[PDB]
């Protein structure tokens, strides 16, 4: 009944289209939730999409000025993958930060809400409020914004608390049926760790995070699900994935330390490893969240100083808006497949012809077959939609 | 299969956020039922929210003047906890008063409707109309407006009939698979008993009610689920929980009798006991239903003249509107947890910029871990919503 992710990793030559929600296009006619920060997670049967909704629909007076991220009204919305966030959507907890697991028996939700100084994480398992934690650093407590990973019933959640540009306390929480059985403080070479995309690299969990303080390469957190031992490093490829980042001609990585290049802010993203090569995805524009491309860097998990791509794909076009992206793993018949989702953000603070901010999602999965080209933007026309 | 609530009570140091429906905020855009008097109840798998809907949506011509409580059109609406009362909501009985149990096998609904003089209470079990009762006092027959409690298949419902300010006949009905097997008249020191919040204090049921006639402390009804013997008293803590109430410095309780202080009206609320201490919740404003705070009074279940709070929480801010609140118990892995819900009322008779009255719900559950601070109001802006 429990899920242990024991199978090997599927052979990946690229990613094929899997899903699209068309949320903003449907919001022009119809009642659709205003969301942001989505992700995808699958129980052993099918896949579900999650988002953080702002407590209102888009054709709503309350949709005005929804660019904030921490309000008492944001909740965690869950549907099946494909069903748009209509008014029948079940909102499963109060949260302005969230993460979700399925251990093979029941769903686990980690939900953060509250004052920026105090902040509480409620751990909800099987429809019960099983546990709760308070901020340790008395700052904005926050978590992965994507799926967490369970192996043998022990699920792991990475939670950060502290300054965005400075030393912050990051912890890894080991949860069993909603109860927190252990908590390990982060240790290693990664200085700033946020919004991690974790995947089961049996026998453990590997997370690729964002460095929001001093690096444009991504941190790596290796969690031993068993000994509860944490290792930290940086993604070693010379083609770094955070945005803002420097141009490919002049970008660098350290494989241990932040590169100290255009590391002021960042975006949530993903990466995983195929032998020595690294499969990664990033925005096409190096400074704005415009476009989205995935590719493979040869000897990129093992060598800084490698800038050799292969199997490049353009999931969203250079001039079309993207945002947070993340990884989730799907148990196949003989191996474990890796899929990713891209959040396509539309609205205020970058397009001033509307008063709202919302997102759509586009989902791709790895394939051992062949694939073509394309581009799957959001597609909404905001010049005609209601303000 | 039956539910017997045999486990101990969970260790409670406070309550953590569990759910929020954002009904009024979504009602501005979208079709949402106009409701009031909600509650929450859980079958052994998940939790459901119930409400008494006025037979109309909010963006409706029939939404005008919905402040009445007894109309031929109010029905009992049931969704999963989290799903807002959209137009796909199943309305499970005709009722302007209601209560609901789950005995581990099927749902029980007690639904009161009809004329104020001759009223009818239908008892519906497993989708059948199993039983029915008429008013005994030929007055407004009414019930708990929250969940009832079943132990070994025998469920218990507290029903009052008679004058709101005077001697009213209160009875406790013992139901088995929808059939009323016994009926005990209330006996003890509690004079007026209404809108009880009951919880399984194995081996029996303990209900904390409202005194709408002569007290601002809450009555207590101890039902022996087995011998069908009823005991009545009052909540003994010096910090009384009803509203209207006197200020903390000048409040009193009797442990046996109404205190005769600001006892004219009241509000439905809850309280339970942790050893000698009492965990309770009340509105922050002592006269209006504004705000909501929960805390613990030390030796408050055994000693009057005790005004020693601890573990205070502010669930709804002092400047925001609240209403009915109630308790419901959730069976955990090793103990029984206590949760409460608060009804956030918005609209006419207190905010004259709209013609309707509705409510939103916020749900908290007890926790043995730590928690922070916050405030979770309804958030609707009625200056911009349709009248």
């Amino acid at each position, epitope marked *: 009944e429990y899920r242990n992710w024991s199978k090997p990793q599927c052979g990946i030559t690229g990613f094929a289209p899997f899903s699209k929600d068309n949320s903003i296009r449907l919001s022009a006619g119809g009642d659709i939730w205003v969301t942001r920060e989505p992700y995808v997670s699958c129980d052993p049967d099918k896949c579900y999409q999650f988002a953080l909704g702002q407590g209102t629909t888009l054709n709503n007076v309350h949709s005005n000025n929804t660019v904030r991220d921490r309000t008492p009204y944001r909740t965690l919305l869950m549907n099946e993958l494909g069903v748009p966030f209509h008014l029948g959507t079940k909102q499963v907890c109060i949260a302005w930060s969230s993460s979700s697991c399925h251990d093979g028996k029941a769903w686990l939700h980690v939900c953060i809400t509250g004052d*920026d100084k105090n902040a509480t994480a409620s751990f909800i398992y099987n429809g019960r409020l099983v546990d709760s934690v308070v901020s340790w650093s008395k700052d904005i407590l926050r978590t992965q914004e994507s799926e967490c990973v369970c192996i043998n019933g022990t699920c792991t959640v990475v939670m950060t608390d502290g300054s965005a540009s400075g030393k912050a306390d990051t912890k890894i929480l080991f949860i069993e049926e909603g109860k927190i059985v252990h908590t390990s403080t982060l240790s290693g070479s990664a200085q700033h760790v946020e919004e991690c995309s974790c995947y089961p690299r049996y026998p453990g969990v590997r997370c690729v995070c964002r460095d929001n303080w001093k690096g444009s390469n991504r941190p790596i957190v290796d969690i031993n699900i068993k000994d509860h031992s944490i290792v930290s490093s940086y993604v070693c490829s010379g083609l770094v994935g955070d945005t803002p980042r420097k141009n490919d001609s002049s970008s660098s990585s350290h494989c241990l330390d932040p590169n100290n290049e255009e590391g002021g*802010h960042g975006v949530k993203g993903w990466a995983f490893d195929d032998g020595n090569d690294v499969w990664m995805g990033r925005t096409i524009n190096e400074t704005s969240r415009l476009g989205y491309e995935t590719f493979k860097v040869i000897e990129g998990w093992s060598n800084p100083k490698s800038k050799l791509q292969t199997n490049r794909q353009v999931i969203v076009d250079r001039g079309d808006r993207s945002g947070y992206s993340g990884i989730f793993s799907v148990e196949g018949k003989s191996c474990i497949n890796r899929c990713f989702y891209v959040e396509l953000i539309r609205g205020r*603070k970058e397009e001033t012809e509307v008063l709202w901010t919302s997102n759509s999602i586009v989902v791709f999965c790895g394939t051992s077959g062949t694939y073509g080209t394309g581009s799957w933007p959001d597609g909404a026309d905001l010049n005609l939609m209601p303000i | 299969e039956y539910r017997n609530w045999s486990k101990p009570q969970c260790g409670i140091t406070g309550f953590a956020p569990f759910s929020k429906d954002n009904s009024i905020r979504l009602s501005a855009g979208g079709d949402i039922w106009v409701t009031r008097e909600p509650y929450v109840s859980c079958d052994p798998d998940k939790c459901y929210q119930f409400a008494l809907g006025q037979g109309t949506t909010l963006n409706n011509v029939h939404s005008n003047n919905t402040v009445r409580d007894r109309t031929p059109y109010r029905t009992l609406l049931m969704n999963e906890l989290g799903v807002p009362f959209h137009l796909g909501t199943k309305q499970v009985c005709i009722a302007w008063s209601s209560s609901s149990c789950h005995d581990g096998k099927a749902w029980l609904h007690v639904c009161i409707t009809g004329d104020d003089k001759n009223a009818t209470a239908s008892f519906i079990y497993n989708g059948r109309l199993v039983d029915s009762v008429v008013s005994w006092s030929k007055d407004i027959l009414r019930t708990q407006e929250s969940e009832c409690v079943c132990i070994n298949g025998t469920c218990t419902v507290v029903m009052t009939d008679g004058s709101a300010s005077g001697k009213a006949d209160t009875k406790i009905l013992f139901i088995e698979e929808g059939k009323i097997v016994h009926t005990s008249t209330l006996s003890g020191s509690a004079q007026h008993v209404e809108e009880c919040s009951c919880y399984p204090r194995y081996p029996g049921v303990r209900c904390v009610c409202r005194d709408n006639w002569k007290g601002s402390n809450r009555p207590i009804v101890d039902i022996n689920i087995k011998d069908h013997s009823i005991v009545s008293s009052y909540v003994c803590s010096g910090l009384v929980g009803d509203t209207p109430r006197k200020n903390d410095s000048s409040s009193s309780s009797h442990c046996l009798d109404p205190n005769n202080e600001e006892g004219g009206h009241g509000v439905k609320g809850w309280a339970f006991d942790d050893g000698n201490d009492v965990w309770m919740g009340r509105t922050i404003n002592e006269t209006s239903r504004l705000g909501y705070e929960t805390f613990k009074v030390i030796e408050g279940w055994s000693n009057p003249k005790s005004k020693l709070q601890t573990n205070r929480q502010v669930i709804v801010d002092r400047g925001d509107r609240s209403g009915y609140s109630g308790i419901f118990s959730v069976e955990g892995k090793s103990c029984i947890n206590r949760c409460f819900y608060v009804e956030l009322i918005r609209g006419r008779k207190e905010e004259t910029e709209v013609l309707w009255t509705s409510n939103s719900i916020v749900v908290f559950c007890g926790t043995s871990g730590t928690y922070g601070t916050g405030s979770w109001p309804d958030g609707a802006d009625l*200056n911009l919503m349709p009248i």
Partner: antibody
Amino acid sequence: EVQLVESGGGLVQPGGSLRLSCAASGFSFTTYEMNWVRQAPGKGLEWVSHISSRGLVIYYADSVKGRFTMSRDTAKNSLYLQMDSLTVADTAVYYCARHYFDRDWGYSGMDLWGQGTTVTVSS
Amino acid sequence: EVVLTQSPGTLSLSPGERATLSCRASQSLGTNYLAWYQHKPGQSPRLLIDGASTRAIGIPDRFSASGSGTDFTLTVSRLEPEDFAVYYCQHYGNPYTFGQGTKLEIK
């Protein structure tokens, strides 16, 4: 409607103390960064101090540093400026303003402003 | 340590022309923590531009802004009678600093 109302502006002889208060309606200080900004008569805007939503005073202007104390009450939603040893250069119109720190994008910018209170140090 | 010198002081023009205001910065700064405010006298400051390129909520379409590093520019493309005021450029990242302003007066 959100509003900020500053109060406490008055004549102060040099060497004195005045406490300015800014009462906020429609939002909570537990999620917003609050600022004191002053305009001396005939000069431009000057950023006096800044406090986080987590309650830390992030910055005090060099002139005001050591003489002014900025605090907040998150129960009454009030912001306070205790000005000590007021000099004649501190005569100005004072303004409480509000901005935001977003987890994703970062600091935003002062979008809500008060009416203003004038503090004149004289003679 | 970053001093924001608004370049034109007391620019004067007539309704319906294009006005270009400039904020030059001593040292280079993150081009997303600079903002532009309007302070009509007797009224509280109002935020026009944020992140050096983003129009605020409610601001007319006349105002636009641009810039990078040490250079910043604002332009009201077609002036209006009530768009005559003082304009400040602010750096709300570390180090915090305002500008001295630019006065627009009807000729």
